[PDB]
From Swiss-Prot:
Effect recorded for R350A: Complete loss of cAAG binding
Annotated stretches, region: C-terminal SAVED domain: 254-460
Protein name from the UniProt record: CD-NTase-associated protein 4
Biological source species: Enterobacter hormaechei subsp. hoffmannii (strain UCI 50)
Record gene name: cap4
Catalytic activity, EC: 3.1.-.-
Length: 495
């Protein structure tokens, strides 16, 4: 029983995720990672330092990211702009988040980034939600600094913060807020355990599975007792050697590639180099289009061009995937069975991170497959119920909107849909293969289309996309919880 970090296991796991970069050959510019377990202080809970300074969307390369991690509580609450001036919000008697920010801006180099990390969310109609970027969490200075007076909606925020910080002008406030980020709705503690394991496996370290107690939490407490607070690349390699953590010192070198369509959190933003990264939410400047014509005309060409560029130069690819289901399926089609690209998938999401490949074998029973006739048309639907039963909603959409569909093929894993219905990449591939066999045996004429409705994680959708080349003309669909308050399908890509 050792003394915990002030941020406890959440802070320790954040640190381990950052420190794994010290032994990542594809992030050699990360030169030091440190933690402050006797806090909170001023944005030093975790610090990641770069040499050369890291690439940035802004005008200056960033020499360090500084993290202030709000004490993790399992039940997530809400906060607004008024909370940023309250010390209790960061679990302290004095010094708010903004005062800590002002101090850190006083002490640290100019080309620095500062992040407030929390599993809580911004209040729905609070002004803070309007000044925090959906792309990367950065403060939206063009939005907060309207050029209005204290009476306006943004003026009230400016006044509260300016007077709390004892500044004379909104210009000084803008100086203080430059480089500040709020990362809301960050992963749960359990997802953080999964992310630590994924990061460690990728860099060739051992992982801690099944065990109800995480080994690396105790390792972090022991490091604190040894007063080892900061690690260069050499120091982290030395720690890994001393701890007997190195599984392989030379794992198979895959080229890291990233495909994302949601928010770019700091944990994931450097998964691949910028030239090997496609972040769709950034291209749409934080406003992702509804599934439809814009997907087939804007998103599809972008994804196809990006993945053709990857395919013609790379033999082995580690694909970090955090996107919509049909985009994952399109990605699979672009890197299909024809490409000759050996694929390792890193599935990232709110559930956590997982690694998929065809290395582990499987002997699961065949998926239950049931065909139903619903009309006279020559089109065919395939419904994959993997995470949940998708057949009712797909059947409703089809009855209401696709008169040319004459047959619905329903596919469900042997032991039913659920969170873990697909074992591994080999199981996903085998399911895709039996789906392809059934569709090919259905003998669709060449003019007809195969409509694909899927309720599955990104990796399963990717492996299915890899086989859509065998199925001819296809229409991919997106399930949206908007038009119908409990969800409904919309066509996205026609391939
Ligand atoms: Cl004032």
């Amino acid at each position: 029983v050792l003394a915990n970090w002030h941020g406890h296991d959440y802070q320790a796991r954040y640190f381990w995720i950052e420190a794994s970069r010290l032994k990542n050959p594809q992030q050699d510019f990360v030169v030091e990672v440190s933690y402050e377990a006797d806090g909170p202080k001023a944005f030093d809970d975790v610090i990641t330092r770069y040499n050369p300074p890291r690439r940035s969307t802004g005008p200056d390369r960033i020499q360090a990211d500084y993290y202030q991690i709000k004490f993790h509580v399992t039940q997530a609450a809400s906060f607004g702009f008024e909370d940023l001036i309250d010390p209790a919000f960061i679990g302290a008697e004095t010094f708010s988040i903004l005062e800590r920010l002002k101090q850190a801006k006083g002490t640290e180099p100019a080309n620095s980034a500062f992040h407030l990390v929390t599993t809580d969310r911004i209040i729905d109609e609070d002004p803070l939600g309007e000044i925090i970027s959906n792309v990367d969490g950065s403060i939206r200075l063009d939005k907060l600094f309207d050029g209005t007076t204290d009476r306006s909606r943004k003026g009230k925020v400016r006044k509260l913060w300016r007077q709390h910080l004892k500044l004379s002008t909104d210009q000084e406030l803008e100086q203080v807020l430059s480089g500040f980020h709020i990362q809301q709705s960050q992963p749960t503690l359990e997802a953080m355990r999964e992310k630590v394991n994924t990061c460690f496996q990728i860099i060739g370290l051992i992982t801690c599975e099944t065990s109800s107690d995480f080994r690396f939490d105790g390792a972090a407490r022991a490091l604190r007792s040894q007063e080892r607070y900061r690690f260069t690349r050499e120091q982290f390699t030395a720690l890994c050697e001393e701890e007997n953590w190195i599984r392989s010192e030379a794992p198979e070198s895959f080229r890291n590639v990233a495909l994302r369509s949601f928010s770019d959190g700091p944990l994931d933003i450097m998964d691949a180099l910028p030239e090997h990264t496609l972040s769709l939410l950034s291209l749409f400047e934080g406003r992702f289009p509804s599934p439809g014509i814009e997907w087939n005309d804007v998103i599809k060409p972008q994804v196809e061009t990006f993945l053709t560029g990857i395919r013609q130069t790379e033999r082995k690819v580690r694909l970090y995937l955090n996107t919509h289901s049909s985009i994952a399926m399109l990605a699979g089609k672009c890197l299909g069975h024809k490409s000759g690209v050996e694929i390792e998938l890193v599935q990232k999401g709110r559930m956590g991170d997982s690694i998929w490949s065809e290395n582990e074998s499987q002997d699961e029973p065949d998926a239950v497959i049931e065909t139903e006739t619903v009309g006279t048309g020559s089109d065919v639907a395939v419904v994959l119920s993997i995470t949940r039963n998708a057949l009712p909603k797909a059947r409703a959409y089809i009855l209401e909107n696709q008169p040319d569909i004459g047959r619905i093929i329903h596919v469900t894993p042997a032991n039913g849909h659920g969170q873990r219905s697909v074992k591994n990449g080999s199981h996903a591939v085998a399911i895709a293969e039996q789906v392809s066999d059934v569709v090919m045996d259905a003998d669709l004429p060449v003019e007809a289309s195969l409509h694909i409705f899927s309720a599955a994680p990104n990796a399963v959708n990717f492996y299915l996309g890899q086989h859509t080349d065998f199925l001819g003309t296809c229409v991919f669909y997106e399930f949206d919880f908007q038009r119908q308050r409990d969800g409904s399908y919309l066509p996205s890509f026609k391939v």
